[PDB]
Design a protein around this ligand. Structure first.
Ligand SMILES: [Mg+2]
Ligand SMILES: [Mg+2]
Ligand SMILES: [Mg+2]
Ligand SMILES: [Mg+2]
Ligand SMILES: [Mg+2]
Ligand SMILES: [Mg+2]
Ligand SMILES: [Mg+2]
Ligand SMILES: [Mg+2]
Ligand SMILES: [Mg+2]
Ligand SMILES: [Mg+2]
Ligand SMILES: [Mg+2]
Ligand SMILES: [Mg+2]
Ligand SMILES: [Mg+2]
Ligand SMILES: [Mg+2]
Ligand SMILES: [Mg+2]
Ligand SMILES: [Mg+2]
Ligand SMILES: [Mg+2]
Ligand SMILES: [Mg+2]
Ligand SMILES: [Mg+2]
Ligand SMILES: [Mg+2]
Ligand SMILES: [Mg+2]
Ligand SMILES: [Mg+2]
Ligand SMILES: [Mg+2]
Ligand SMILES: [Mg+2]
Ligand SMILES: [Mg+2]
Ligand SMILES: [Mg+2]
Ligand SMILES: [Zn+2]
Lengths: 174, 60, 37, 213, 146
RNA sequence: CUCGAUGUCGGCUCGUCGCAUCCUGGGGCUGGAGCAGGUCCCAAGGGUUGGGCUGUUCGCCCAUUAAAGCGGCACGCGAGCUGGGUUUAGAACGUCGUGAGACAGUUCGGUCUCUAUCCGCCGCGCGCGUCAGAAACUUGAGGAAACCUGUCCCUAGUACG
RNA sequence: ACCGCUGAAAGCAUCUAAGCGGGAAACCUUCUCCAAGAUCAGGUUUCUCACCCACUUGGUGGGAUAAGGCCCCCCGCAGA
């Protein structure tokens, strides 16, 4: 049922489909994507984005759901970006920023510095709460996972970084 | 076969064509005239094409 | 990760999937994580 | 910007550092070099600079080689060898005919020295490859320095390529890496490289900056 | 007496084969046939018939991704353990013309004459070849309908 | 297959290969708090000790080590070595046999030939080729070699307990 | 190996089906050495770049040479 439903667009002054490619823009920065060749993209009566496929094939059903979710990701990333709330646990572990860069004092003999690439921004709300924001959903999730894996899983004290509200498994320990 | 596919026919079907057309010229002389008289070879290809059945692929 | 030619779900939340040409079971319990080989 | 100089091994000696520690040094007269040619990526396909070293009488050089020297506009030299550089910013500093000399290297820098190791003649397997040889006694019959077995049996019915056997040692191009430059004296064009340098006393050596640092 | 070509009866032309979307095997068969001279009725297996073949755009020969990842080129130096493995995928990056030429050479008969045959083959990664002094006619791959 | 002969064990010397990995390297799970481990997965680049006993292989032991891996290659390798064992002829013991003698029973002694033709390999030349003849300097297709590891100090007696 | 991001088929979910990452003494570069007999016999240069005779006048033979080299000689820490 993913795919057979239009793409809502709040403003989309320049959501364009040129030569089997989509490019979305607006009040925030640009995004672009290429869609696989069986899938077409067109308008609705209100000017939305619809994805269509040749009917009832194993490969094209998967591609069609893929394309619908991807274009949904672009058209939401422009309107309002993805912000992953990450959060540190473990006494003595903390975050801080140096411009676009930040470092963690997460138990090593050195600070760990993550230099922010393009399109993604870093921000602490606390020396425990931090945030990776951006306009590409895949890139944001990838950088957030890069942060998430800095510390090995600790099921005994939970020392390390997390995503907010997501709780890791524990064990009794000693 | 080389001469036949210069005249856009496989040796496969040229041999049928000559059989059906009733041409009993053997491959000694077919090859030798493919070299010496290519225009005559093209004529033989034409008669072989004509003798071929319209749908060379359907059962007889 | 248990590497055996016979992999089957252990508990009710063992999803048994097939990734990269090989079948395996992934579950919330990592002790149940288990791969065909 | 890898730097290099063509010189002669003048033999070794010892000196003493400021720490009162003995330091075995091979002294290399990095006699002045002239360039005579720049190798460029768009005309030769790679970046290098020829260096000419060593006084030779002009009558001793054949006219095909004197023509190259005179097209370079320099007096004919005895040795000529290229220093290979990286692929960009190649000849922003080397000009044909510039006179590059020992103090291109600095005190305490690290160099790679290339030479032709000393000839050893036709060498046996112990001397050439460090084979253990066989026992001097306990019945050993005339195999005291002989290689021993050189292959398997019916499988494979052959001896593998690269089997270490007797043959000529030495006269090999050899590079020793990360030799300290104890001292370069500009007064007379000699650098005092700590350690051993391949080849004859008197042999041609190329001293380059150590890329391993 | 069946015709046997003389020395001097062999007239050689020059073809350019664009490899931009051709399956590598199709390209190799066509090049081998054309460069041997199987297509001309004057063919003799003991004669260097056949024309000159320039393959261009060897970088974009059609090789499926599975072959680009898994098909391996094997080279034994003759030293023990001297088997060196490369992948079609990385020879495409380094020496794609070598991939095309290796395919041709495998199609060619394994004999002395083929050593002279393969001398008439030029393979180029880019869209340009230096052999414009001739007038190398383009040659497309065709299949005779049956 | 070999009886108009394919030299048998162990050692030495030289290796080379597989990975079913002993160490070093990377990981998953743990009845993984930490230190150590257990197990499984990936990984063959390198390394993988010296002695005592025994002909030994094996094995046990000593002292180490990061580790003291397992296998193949005619149980690799005697036109490379040894010749201690086995497996000729001497002799003795036990045992069997009336005896001559015999014994995967023991004991002492007892052998190691060949000037390399071909392939192969290690080196070194001569010739020719390389679209005129030469000289110098070179590119690098493609190869070869090489690839080990410990302890201590700081981090920090901190994390963990 | 393993750990992922985005993500459907399968409204969820899932490292995978499209796609994108991290990842080891293994592999390829990088270090060292050999290397154009690499017969695809390479490149940059520099030097000579010149004649004479005869025939069946020929990418012809010779002769003479050039650049260059070899042999001879004095040797070498180069070496059978
Ligand atoms: Mg089971
Ligand atoms: Mg994978
Ligand atoms: Mg000597
Ligand atoms: Mg020894
Ligand atoms: Mg000895
Ligand atoms: Mg003797
Ligand atoms: Mg002796
Ligand atoms: Mg016999
Ligand atoms: Mg394994
Ligand atoms: Mg483990
Ligand atoms: Mg090993
Ligand atoms: Mg390696
Ligand atoms: Mg003793
Ligand atoms: Mg072994
Ligand atoms: Mg044996
Ligand atoms: Mg053995
Ligand atoms: Mg033996
Ligand atoms: Mg033998
Ligand atoms: Mg009795
Ligand atoms: Mg007996
Ligand atoms: Mg005895
Ligand atoms: Mg001998
Ligand atoms: Mg190379
Ligand atoms: Mg070769
Ligand atoms: Mg070289
Ligand atoms: Mg050359
Ligand atoms: Zn489970």
């Amino acid at each position: 049922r993913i795919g057979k439903q239009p793409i809502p667009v709040p403003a989309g002054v320049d959501v364009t489909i040129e030569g089997q490619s989509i490019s979305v823009k607006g009040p925030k920065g640009t995004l672009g994507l290429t869609v696989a060749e069986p899938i077409k993209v067109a308008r609705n009566d209100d000017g939305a984005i619809v994805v269509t496929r040749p009917d009832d094939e194993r490969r094209n059903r998967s591609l069609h759901g893929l394309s619908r979710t991807l274009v949904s990701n672009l058209v939401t990333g422009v309107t309002q970006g993805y912000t992953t709330k990450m959060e540190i646990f473990g006494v003595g572990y903390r975050v801080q920023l140096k411009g676009s860069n930040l470092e963690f004092a997460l138990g090593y003999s050195h600070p760990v510095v993550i230099e922010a690439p393009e399109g993604i921004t870093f921000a602490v709300q606390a020396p425990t709460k931090f945030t990776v924001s951006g306009i590409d959903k895949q890139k944001v999730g990838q950088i957030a996972a890069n942060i998430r894996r800095l510390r090995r899983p600790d099921p005994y004290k939970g020392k390390g970084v997390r995503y907010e509200g997501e709780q890791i498994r524990r064990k009794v320990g000693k | 076969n080389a001469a036949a596919r210069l005249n856009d026919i496989t040796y496969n079907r040229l041999i049928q064509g000559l059989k059906a057309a009733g041409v009993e010229v053997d491959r000694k002389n077919l090859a030798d005239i493919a070299i010496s008289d290519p225009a005559a070879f093209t004529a033989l290809v034409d008669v072989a094409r004509a003798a071929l059945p319209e749908d060379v692929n359907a059962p007889s | 990760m248990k590497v055996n030619p016979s992999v089957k779900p252990i508990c009710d939340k063992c999803r048994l999937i097939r990734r990269h040409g090989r079948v395996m079971v992934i579950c919330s319990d990592p002790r149940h994580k288990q791969r065909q080989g | 910007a890898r730097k290099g100089i063509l010189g002669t091994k003048l033999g070794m000696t010892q000196v003493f550092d400021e720490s009162n520690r003995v330091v075995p040094v091979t002294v290399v007269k990095a006699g002045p070099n002239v360039v005579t040619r720049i190798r460029t990526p768009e005309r030769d396909g790679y970046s290098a600079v020829q260096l000419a070293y060593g006084e030779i009488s002009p009558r001793k050089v054949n006219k095909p080689l004197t023509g190259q020297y005179t097209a370079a506009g320099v007096n004919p030299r005895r040795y000529l060898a290229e220093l290979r550089l990286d692929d960009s910013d190649a000849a922003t500093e080397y000009q044909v005919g510039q006179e590059l000399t020992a103090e291109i290297f600095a005190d305490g820098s690290y160099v790679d020295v290339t030479g032709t190791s000393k000839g050893k003649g036709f060498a046996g397997t112990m001397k050439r490859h460090g084979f253990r040889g066989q026992g001097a006694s306990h019945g050993a019959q005339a195999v005291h320095r002989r290689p021993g077995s050189i292959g398997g049996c019916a499988t494979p019915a052959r001896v593998f390529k690269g089997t270490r056997m007797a043959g000529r040692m030495g006269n090999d191009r050899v590079t020793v890496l990360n030799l300290l430059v104890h001292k370069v004296d500009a007064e007379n064009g000699v650098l005092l490289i700590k350690g051993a340098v391949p080849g004859r006393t008197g042999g041609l050596v190329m001293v380059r900056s150590a890329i391993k640092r | 007496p069946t015709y046997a070509p003389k020395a001097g009866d062999t007239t050689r032309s020059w073809y350019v084969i664009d490899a931009t979307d051709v399956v590598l095997g199709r390209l190799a068969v066509a090049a081998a046939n054309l460069l041997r001279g199987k297509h001309k009725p004057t063919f003799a297996p003991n004669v260097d018939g056949g024309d000159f073949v320039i393959v261009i755009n060897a970088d974009k020969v059609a090789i499926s991704g599975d072959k680009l990842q898994h098909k391996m080129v094997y080279r034994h130096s003759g030293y023990p353990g001297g088997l060196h493995k490369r992948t079609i995928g990385e020879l495409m990056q380094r020496h794609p013309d070598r991939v095309v030429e290796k395919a041709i050479l495998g199609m060619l008969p394994k004999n002395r004459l083929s050593r002279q045959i393969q001398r008439k083959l030029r393979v180029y990664a880019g869209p340009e070849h230096p052999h414009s002094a001739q007038q190398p006619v383009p040659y497309e791959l065709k299949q005779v309908a049956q």
